[PDB]
Amino acid sequence: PRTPVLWLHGLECTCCSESFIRSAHPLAKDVVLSMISLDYDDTLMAAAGHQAEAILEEIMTKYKGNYILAVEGNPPLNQDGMSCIIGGRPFIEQLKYVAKDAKAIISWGSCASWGGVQAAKPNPTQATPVHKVITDKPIIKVPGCPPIAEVMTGVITYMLTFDRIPELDRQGRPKMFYSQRIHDKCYRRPHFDAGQFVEEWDDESARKGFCLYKMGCKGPTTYNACSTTRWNEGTSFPIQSGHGCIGCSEDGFWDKGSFYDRLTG
Amino acid sequence: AYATQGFNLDDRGRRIVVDPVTRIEGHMRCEVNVDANNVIRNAVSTGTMWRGLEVILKGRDPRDAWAFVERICGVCTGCHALASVRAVENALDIRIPKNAHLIREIMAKTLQVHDHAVHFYHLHALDWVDVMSALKADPKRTSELQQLVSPAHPLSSAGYFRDIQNRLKRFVESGQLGPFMNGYWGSKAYVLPPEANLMAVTHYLEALDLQKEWVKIHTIFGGKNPHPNYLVGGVPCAINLDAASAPVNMERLSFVKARIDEIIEFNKNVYVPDVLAIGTLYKQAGWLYGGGLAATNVLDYGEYPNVAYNKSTDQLPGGAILNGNWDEVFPVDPRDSQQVQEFVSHSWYKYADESVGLHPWDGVTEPNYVLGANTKGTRTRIEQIDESAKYSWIKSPRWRGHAMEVGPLSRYILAYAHARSGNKYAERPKEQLEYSAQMINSAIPKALGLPETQYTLKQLLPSTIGRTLARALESQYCGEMMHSDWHDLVANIRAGDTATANVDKWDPATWPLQAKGVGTVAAPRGALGHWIRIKDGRIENYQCVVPTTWNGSPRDYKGQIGAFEASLMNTPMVNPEQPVEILRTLHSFDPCLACSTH
Ligand code: SF4
Numbered sequence A: 001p002r003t004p005v006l007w008l009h010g011l012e013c014t015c016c017s018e019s020f021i022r023s024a025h026p027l028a029k030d031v032v033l034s035m036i037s038l039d040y041d042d043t044l045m046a047a048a049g050h051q052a053e054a055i056l057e058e059i060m061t062k063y064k065g066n067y068i069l070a071v072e073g074n075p076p077l078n079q080d081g082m083s084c085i086i087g088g089r090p091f092i093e094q095l096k097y098v099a100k101d102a103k104a105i106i107s108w109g110s111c112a113s114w115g116g117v118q119a120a121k122p123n124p125t126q127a128t129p130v131h132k133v134i135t136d137k138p139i140i141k142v143p144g145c146p147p148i149a150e151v152m153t154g155v156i157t158y159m160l161t162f163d164r165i166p167e168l169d170r171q172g173r174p175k176m177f178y179s180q181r182i183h184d185k186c187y188r189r190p191h192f193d194a195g196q197f198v199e200e201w202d203d204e205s206a207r208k209g210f211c212l213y214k215m216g217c218k219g220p221t222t223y224n225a226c227s228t229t230r231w232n233e234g235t236s237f238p239i240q241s242g243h244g245c246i247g248c249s250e251d252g253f254w255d256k257g258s259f260y261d262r263l264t265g
Numbered sequence B: 001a002y003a004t005q006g007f008n009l010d011d012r013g014r015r016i017v018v019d020p021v022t023r024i025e026g027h028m029r030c031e032v033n034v035d036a037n038n039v040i041r042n043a044v045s046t047g048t049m050w051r052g053l054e055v056i057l058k059g060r061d062p063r064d065a066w067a068f069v070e071r072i073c074g075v076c077t078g079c080h081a082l083a084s085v086r087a088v089e090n091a092l093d094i095r096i097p098k099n100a101h102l103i104r105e106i107m108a109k110t111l112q113v114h115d116h117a118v119h120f121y122h123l124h125a126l127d128w129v130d131v132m133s134a135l136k137a138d139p140k141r142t143s144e145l146q147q148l149v150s151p152a153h154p155l156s157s158a159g160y161f162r163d164i165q166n167r168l169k170r171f172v173e174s175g176q177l178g179p180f181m182n183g184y185w186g187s188k189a190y191v192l193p194p195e196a197n198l199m200a201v202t203h204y205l206e207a208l209d210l211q212k213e214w215v216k217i218h219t220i221f222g223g224k225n226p227h228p229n230y231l232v233g234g235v236p237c238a239i240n241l242d243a244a245s246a247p248v249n250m251e252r253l254s255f256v257k258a259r260i261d262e263i264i265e266f267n268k269n270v271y272v273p274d275v276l277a278i279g280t281l282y283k284q285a286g287w288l289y290g291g292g293l294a295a296t297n298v299l300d301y302g303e304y305p306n307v308a309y310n311k312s313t314d315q316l317p318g319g320a321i322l323n324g325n326w327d328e329v330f331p332v333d334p335r336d337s338q339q340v341q342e343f344v345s346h347s348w349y350k351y352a353d354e355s356v357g358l359h360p361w362d363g364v365t366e367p368n369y370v371l372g373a374n375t376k377g378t379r380t381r382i383e384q385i386d387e388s389a390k391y392s393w394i395k396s397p398r399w400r401g402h403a404m405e406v407g408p409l410s411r412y413i414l415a416y417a418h419a420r421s422g423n424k425y426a427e428r429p430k431e432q433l434e435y436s437a438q439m440i441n442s443a444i445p446k447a448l449g450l451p452e453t454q455y456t457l458k459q460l461l462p463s464t465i466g467r468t469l470a471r472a473l474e475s476q477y478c479g480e481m482m483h484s485d486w487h488d489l490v491a492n493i494r495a496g497d498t499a500t501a502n503v504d505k506w507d508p509a510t511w512p513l514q515a516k517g518v519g520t521v522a523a524p525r526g527a528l529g530h531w532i533r534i535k536d537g538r539i540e541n542y543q544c545v546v547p548t549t550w551n552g553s554p555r556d557y558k559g560q561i562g563a564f565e566a567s568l569m570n571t572p573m574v575n576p577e578q579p580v581e582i583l584r585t586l587h588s589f590d591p592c593l594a595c596s597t598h
């Protein structure tokens, strides 16, 4: 049998779901038909309302301690949790209920991992990342806004193949995808090394692909596979297309100053 | 009970709750009341999420705003970023160069195609298609139906269909149905024969593989998809032909062109024919419900001028229609404080005075989660929402006090109206509509051995079928437009203009100390606007009015209903405990709840 995945959505923009289906190796189609059993997921599932919620207890009973809980987005603590309502109840109640019998928990994206855009100051809903709510279960964080498609399916593929969570760094991220900073292997690195920078958008330097550090590129402080694995079957990545990394996979990047303010050290 | 907009709302019948509404973006609760014959006589739209992006933006740099508001939604990804940069450019009197304009249009039209096609197959189709019925299609007959529905589509052989069918069979025979688990399969609300069902599920799977190719256009110009990068003043993807180190060279543009041509093929051969065929059969079954406000009141800001910054050349020309009068299109001004206004009378927010609607330059977003006295259940466990008080995280936008439907259907009704008044920029959508009417009324019925009908566009369009149809036609038209945009872009580059960003007012020291601006976008789901106030280089106010905010809106101060609630009215349900008809019509608006609430 294929391992059941219960994919819950909290406060979110749904970019991780979209990114997931952009995966070429493997195809999302093959993931869903041949690898996992995607038994709950608001965005794709046929059933709604009472029929949708009935699926949760059925899968939890039958596959107790042998299903993966995937979480996109996060729970709010303000408004008595009712700034995210599911089945008339706060999302945080659904999250805690489904998490208690999961063999593993995946925090998809920066929302679930760290808090996301909704947790940026002043955070009116008190959006809280999954690991601050679920404290007694093993969680793997797959940060990024969204994470690269192949990173997402790569995590799933490893977990399905070995029945284990991959080795994690201190922050709970898989080392197989998050051990390098963007800056390590960025193809503009030789320009950085020679002090060759863009100073204004569409200056001569920009038309020659010079380093984007002075335009605010946060590649030197951001861990992700963007400069190597790259995006959408290795088509490009933010830096290749001419905009600096904004640090979207790092904890609290929204409140680390303007995206166009350069790093100092 | 009370009457509004020609609808007789009555909450005395059996109450039915749908929470969660699935196969949408984000979180929605829907409640209806049905009469003794299972006809919906009341409908309640509840947005069940909020994040407060408008609050979060206060005090930040306007140049950073696009990246924040882009994360309103990863489905309509980039449309908020476009609205934001337009708004800031409007406030600061910045004109972008021609290449930046064309690249933004291409990115926008790429989103339209991707968004529309994925929605129809992966969110909407299971409201029309019974997957279990597809298990019993004759592969030969399915091949035969495919040749009639779209002769040009190469994937049509009999073997190819039993291949798909057999993979579905053992998927279902495994006992783990995945996304098909607990479905409403077998309901009499499904009318398609097995062959149509297998054909559609095949295209569901085809589309799932292809959709990832289309967005590589975003990846080239914007680095990544979801959430491509944008820029105040232009685009970051600098151009150099002679070169491999610049973001955009001729090789990258050739790649973009190849993807556009694939899009045009998919729209013409798969998407539009499927919707025409599925639409024909449900029209034959008499399922013309779900028109709602489309029968009277539709709005769009107007979009896609073939001459930049000249709104009279909009290829999807906008404005407002009232009371079903298609002979008179009122101009819509996003700057006019008496036009676009938002009420919170029945929303979980507070104003100083909630008997008035606020224009978004004067907009206020202060949360106020409180439930009415007639609620069944508690504050943290709602059994039956009280629609007589505040019942949604969605605000209530109105235009000059009128409730409007927005979206591809609205744009196509507006384009049709414009074409009749002599507007030649709307000629293609008119051609599409009349071609579609003739295909649905005569050509497809004739091919399928069915009686031919004589529905006019006035009768056919204001319906759930019509709303689904317009989405497919808009996808096709957007593909055709970006094909032309590509040629204009390449021609401009080859003529010597390589400019991609205007940076004259990039530095805040050049800005006026106070400024306000508005950016509008014909987003996939309808009329999108961002309204900004700038003070001393910071965001003083930032307010979004988003398409699903219009459509999904709760009642206003006068008690007028929004598009969702109006469209569910007067619709029979085969089984009141199975929300098949509710989902079909709701999904025809392509609801994006994160968008609606932001
Ligand atoms: S563009 Fe960014 S990541 Fe690449 S070399 Fe420059 S600073 Fe490092």
Ligand code: F3S
Pocket (backbone or CB within 6 Å): A144, A145, A182, A222, A223, A224, A226, A237, A238, A239, A244, A245, A246, A247, A248, A249, B224
């Ligand atoms: S902005 Fe994000 S997608 Fe990668 S290049 Fe930077 S971590």
Ligand SMILES: [Cl-]
Pocket (backbone or CB within 6 Å): A110, A111, A114, A115, A116, A117, A250, A251, A252, A253, A254
């Ligand atoms: Cl974050």
Ligand SMILES: [Mg+2]
Pocket (backbone or CB within 6 Å): B054, B395, B543, B544, B545, B546, B598
């Ligand atoms: Mg708003």
